[PDB]
């Protein structure tokens, strides 16, 4: 959509000599061996590798030289989207899941208010490798009619 | 079963007197609590005093104050945030102090980070020490009530222990330690030369060749020949020309004659041995013209509740740490921090907001006793009584004077904002138009400055550079000190202050003595200090209690307090702080115009609140980033508190009634109910966030715009 | 937050790609979609080249308006 | 003034009496539950509306209801 | 002692040692993964 990639953006070009030149203004203040300038100097190689990984990755940029991305579902972006989605959609399940099912241990219990301010270690551990198969558990509970009350 | 008992558990935490109703443990639990407020205090000061030796820049900046930008943090480089290490000088990167801790470290003679490092394993084994000893006294060794009443003894070893001889040995600290090192500082000695400490108690020709008078040894004491250590402890006054502090054997001289008197005015009350006067009966013979009977009957009531003890506590602290912020800033006590402008506009703003938030603590704890421990029937008093049969005529009077003071004080500034926008700058109250001079403030000033040499025998100079008269102070090319104008500007603020302490203290006034009755709620001594309302009749009775007029009264100690600090920060700005030339002109920051610009309400919003934060806007990718940082999340709080403030309790728990059954339809229902916050608590929370962003904003403001310039 | 550290290049800046879609399909040619109006040869253009096109075209193509501007993250 | 209903659903426990700051309520005999007794209101001219007696009712909902209206000098308890 | 643990499994405590864990964590991927837009996997 009118997008250049990274690797011939010369606005990228020019932001990261600009960020190198600024960084470079300060290491002439301290002598070459002190501790401040060898901190110094291990930040110009960080900035070296951030643009350069940038570039290695097909990220496209626009006039203003900062990279953009796409969301529409493209097969050539999908690790910017479509990739961190599915890892997070498992993870807030998994959490989710356990969180369910430490619930329903304790609610056939004579007080169940009272475990949940002193937490059962004990079978909060058990639990919780549960929700590694959460989703397989969840799409057959569903089909059993168990998930909703 | 509810979760307002999550909330309970934390609101009742520290009072002791709904717990029990025994004194003996109230006051046990006091003592303890006291001990562990030490401890926590003693472990701050060694943090503070460790990390100055580490991580700190002390050495360059003690051979070269000022040059150099104090530094005492260090960051760490995992998410690109070791931006904020900025180039503070001296080979050193880090994060730039404003707590004025290497002025008192070089005016206490350390040269090196050797002594530090012991000061704070020092500090550490007294927290402990401190620890131990409230454990102790608590579990093992409990004292008795009988202990506690004994005040007559308590005001004994506070004045003349504590207080008595903690001078003394100041002063003998100074004598012996902070004269000499501060007297080769000063000649430019280079500091890795100096001698040690002990050098100077061990051998003594050594001191004697900077004073001669030490040569004479400690006859001259005993044989009333006091003349001959006028070496080092002088009468002069003024500020030092090298540093730009006091003079230090001025302060050797001070603290001498405090710890005197001190020790002299310790030994007043009577103990077993039946010299000295009893506190009753020195409030019971009182009985002057107009009191009648007199104080009769306050022993009692201060001797048998902690309530109105904190409250006079309180109100004497605050009264004493605004004043303390006042002093400091007109005379200077330690070097380099005059012209070291960062640390001097960041002492002043902090005494003042704990003086506020003191003397409110101290009206709410006068409330809290009227309402829980008054007892005309065993603990009456007449004062009180009368102060309470006409409370009405009280009230009402100070009502009036409220709105006469804001007229008169703000009507001014809105005449003078319509009178400039209709192009007639002729008919406004300013130095060209219209002069309101505060006449008796510059005769004070006059009086003051003549003072020395006509009432003052022995004064070499004026006690401040403040008054009209004395000479101009620079050290390293900045003003220090010079006298203050005060002019038509200067009256109008004075007005506003008057007019914000005196809301302030009739709100708070009109709390404490409603806080048992009124006309509207006769039975409001049963319903507690700390309750919401008394239901939607008589036309509706929100907040009754004393706590919502210490709620309302907060609000408006933050009004006050804010004029105050931006009334300082511009006039400092404006008038007295700069740089002077070699030739000895004087530029200053923003070239005086507080005289003409802070007459109409425009001139703040443009000359001061537009103009001035440029800084903290412009602070993005460079080292003071995270004052721009904090700017803006401080007005997300401020807007944040407004929710709790304008809104009620039955929307958010009706909300909560329909999540609850979207959470009931998946089993995943607590067992725990949820509730919204009580009435009382929804308020709490508003006033926190409220006062938290504001105080913030400021504090960034501030810091991002006095470093830079 | 990224950009107070001084590396604006770390921002999560998403282009409106819907947008900018239904904007080609109207006919602008700032993104090169080539759909609908945008495209000459399409069943859309050829209906109503010769009653409404040319002016419309004419108009949303200028810049210079507030017609169907350009938009971003 | 206010109005002031009593429902069936009282218990006869006498707490709302007991509350009242002004002297509106008092029970009276009634053989409609354990207790043999129920709540009355004869005196609404002087109920001011603080509905401290609908804080002290322990049913599932009140048996004592208090609907405000119009406002005269006893029930906007001035003293001017 | 029985108390110590019963003490320890308090929502205050657990959720504190948690959070520092959990944040200790993350500060361990954003040292070793250093400003990360993409998966390049
Ligand atoms: C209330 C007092 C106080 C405060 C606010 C701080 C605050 C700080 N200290 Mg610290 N410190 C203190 C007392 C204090 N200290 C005392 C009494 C000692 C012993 C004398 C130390 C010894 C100490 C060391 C040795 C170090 C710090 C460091 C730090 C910084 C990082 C803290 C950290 O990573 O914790 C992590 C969380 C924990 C629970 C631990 C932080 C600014 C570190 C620093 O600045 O490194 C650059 C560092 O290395 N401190
Ligand atoms: C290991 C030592 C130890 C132990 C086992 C106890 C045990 C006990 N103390 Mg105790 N106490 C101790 C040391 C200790 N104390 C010390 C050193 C002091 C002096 C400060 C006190 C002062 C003290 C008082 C004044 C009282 C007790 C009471 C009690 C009893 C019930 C309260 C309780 O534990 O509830 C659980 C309480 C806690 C877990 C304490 C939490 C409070 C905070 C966390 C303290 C930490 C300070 C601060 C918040 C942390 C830094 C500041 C900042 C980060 C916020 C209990 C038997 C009470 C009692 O017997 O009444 C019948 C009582 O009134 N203690
Ligand atoms: C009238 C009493 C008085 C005064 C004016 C001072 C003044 C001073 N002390 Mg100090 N001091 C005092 C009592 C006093 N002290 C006592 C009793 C002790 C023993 C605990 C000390 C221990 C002490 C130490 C250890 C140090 C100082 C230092 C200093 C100087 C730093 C400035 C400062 O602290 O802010 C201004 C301070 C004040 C305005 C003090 C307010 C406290 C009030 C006066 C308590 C006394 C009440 C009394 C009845 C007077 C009522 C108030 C008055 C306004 C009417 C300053 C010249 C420091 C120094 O020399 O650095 C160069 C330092 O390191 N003092
Ligand atoms: C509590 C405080 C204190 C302490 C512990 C000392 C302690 C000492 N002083 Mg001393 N001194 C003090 C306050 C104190 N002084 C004050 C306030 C003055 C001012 C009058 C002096 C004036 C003074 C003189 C003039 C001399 C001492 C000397 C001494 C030492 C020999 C005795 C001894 C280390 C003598 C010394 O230097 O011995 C080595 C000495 O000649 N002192
Ligand atoms: C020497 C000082 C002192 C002492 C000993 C006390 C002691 C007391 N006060 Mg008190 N008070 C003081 C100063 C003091 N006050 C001042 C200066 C004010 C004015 C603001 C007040 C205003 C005040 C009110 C309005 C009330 C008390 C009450 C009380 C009593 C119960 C306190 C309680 O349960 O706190 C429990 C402790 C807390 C609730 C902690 C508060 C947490 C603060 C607000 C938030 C801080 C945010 C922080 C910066 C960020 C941390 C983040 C972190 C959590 C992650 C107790 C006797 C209460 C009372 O007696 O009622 C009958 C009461 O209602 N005080
Ligand atoms: C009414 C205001 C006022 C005030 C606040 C002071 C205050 C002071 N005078 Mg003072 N004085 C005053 C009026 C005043 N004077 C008048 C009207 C006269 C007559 C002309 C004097 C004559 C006078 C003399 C002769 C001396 C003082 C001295 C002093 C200082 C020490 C006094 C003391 O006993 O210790 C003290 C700062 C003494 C001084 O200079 O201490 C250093 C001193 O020797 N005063
Ligand atoms: C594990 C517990 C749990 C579960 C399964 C859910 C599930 C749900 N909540 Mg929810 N919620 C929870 C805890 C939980 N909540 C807590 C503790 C709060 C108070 C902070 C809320 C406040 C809340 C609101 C205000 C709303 C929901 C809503 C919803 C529904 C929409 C989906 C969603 O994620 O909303 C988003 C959920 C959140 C943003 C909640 C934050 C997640 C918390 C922090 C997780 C806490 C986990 C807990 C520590 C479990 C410990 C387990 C351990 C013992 C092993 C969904 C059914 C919405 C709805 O459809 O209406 C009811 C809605 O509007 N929740
Ligand atoms: C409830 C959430 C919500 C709401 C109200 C809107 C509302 C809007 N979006 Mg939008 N959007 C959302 C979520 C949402 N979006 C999400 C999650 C994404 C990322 C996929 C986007 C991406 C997006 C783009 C790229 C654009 C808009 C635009 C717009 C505006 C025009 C209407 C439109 O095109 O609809 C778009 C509606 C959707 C895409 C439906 C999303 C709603 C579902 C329920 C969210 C479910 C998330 C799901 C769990 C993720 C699955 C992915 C996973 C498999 C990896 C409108 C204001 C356009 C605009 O004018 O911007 C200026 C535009 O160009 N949105
Ligand atoms: C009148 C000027 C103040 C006179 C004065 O001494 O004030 C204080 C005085 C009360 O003094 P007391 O009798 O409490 O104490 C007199 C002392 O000499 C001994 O305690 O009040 C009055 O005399 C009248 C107050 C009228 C209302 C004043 C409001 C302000
Ligand atoms: C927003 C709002 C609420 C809602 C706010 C509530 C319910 C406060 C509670 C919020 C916190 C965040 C609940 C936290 C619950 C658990 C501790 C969450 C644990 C899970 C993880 C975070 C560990 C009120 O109840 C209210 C009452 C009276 C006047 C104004 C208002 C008001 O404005
Ligand atoms: S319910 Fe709210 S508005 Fe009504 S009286 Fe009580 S506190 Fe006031
Ligand atoms: S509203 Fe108040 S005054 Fe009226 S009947 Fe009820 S308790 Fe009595
Ligand atoms: S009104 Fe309520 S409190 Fe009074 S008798 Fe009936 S049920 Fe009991």
Known sequence: ?149 | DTTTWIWNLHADAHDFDSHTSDLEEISRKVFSAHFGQLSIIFLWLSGMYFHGARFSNYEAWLSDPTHIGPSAQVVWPIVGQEILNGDVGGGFRGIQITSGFFQIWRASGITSELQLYCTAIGALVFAALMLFAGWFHYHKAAPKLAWFQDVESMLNHHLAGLLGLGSLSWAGHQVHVSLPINQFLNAGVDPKEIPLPHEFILNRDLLAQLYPSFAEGATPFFTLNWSKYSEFLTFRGGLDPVTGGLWLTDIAHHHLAIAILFLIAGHMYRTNWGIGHGIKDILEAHKGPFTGQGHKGLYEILTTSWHAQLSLNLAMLGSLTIIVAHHMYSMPPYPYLATDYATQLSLFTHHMWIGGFLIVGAAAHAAIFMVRDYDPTNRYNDLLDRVLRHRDAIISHLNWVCIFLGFHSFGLYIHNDTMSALGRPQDMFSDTAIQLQPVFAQWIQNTHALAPGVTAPGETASTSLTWGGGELVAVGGKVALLPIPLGTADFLVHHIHAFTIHVTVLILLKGVLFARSSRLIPDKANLGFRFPCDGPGRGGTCQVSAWDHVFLGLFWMYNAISVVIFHFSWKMQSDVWGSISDQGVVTHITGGNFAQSSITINGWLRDFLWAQASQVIQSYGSSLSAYGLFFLGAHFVWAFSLMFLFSGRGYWQELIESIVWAHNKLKVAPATQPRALSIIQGRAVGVTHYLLGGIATTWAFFLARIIAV | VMLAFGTPEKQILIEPIFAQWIQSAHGKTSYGFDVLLSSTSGPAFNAGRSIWLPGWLNAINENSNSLFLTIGP | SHSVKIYDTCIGCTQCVRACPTDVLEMIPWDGCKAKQIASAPRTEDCVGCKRCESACPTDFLSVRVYLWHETTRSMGLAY | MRDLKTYLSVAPVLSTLWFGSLAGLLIEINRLFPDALTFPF
């Open chain 1, 1 to 149: 959509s009118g997008l250049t990639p990274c690797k011939d953006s010369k606005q990228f070009a020019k932001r990261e000599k600009q960020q190198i030149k600024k960084l470079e203004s300060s290491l002439k203040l301290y002598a070459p061996e002190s501790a401040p300038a060898l901190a110094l100097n291990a930040q110009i190689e960080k900035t070296k590798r951030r643009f350069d990984n940038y570039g290695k990755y097909g990220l496209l940029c626009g006039s203003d030289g900062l990279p953009h991305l796409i969301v529409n579902g493209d097969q050539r972006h999908w690790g910017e989207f479509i990739t961190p989605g599915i890892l997070f959609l498992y993870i807030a399940g998994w959490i989710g899941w356990v969180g369910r099912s430490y619930l329903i241990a304790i609610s056939g219990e004579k007080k169940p208010a009272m475990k949940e301010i002193i937490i059962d270690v004990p079978l909060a551990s058990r639990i919780i490798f549960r929700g590694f198969i959460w989703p397989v558990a969840a799409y057959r509970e569903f089909l059993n009619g168990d998930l909703i009350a």
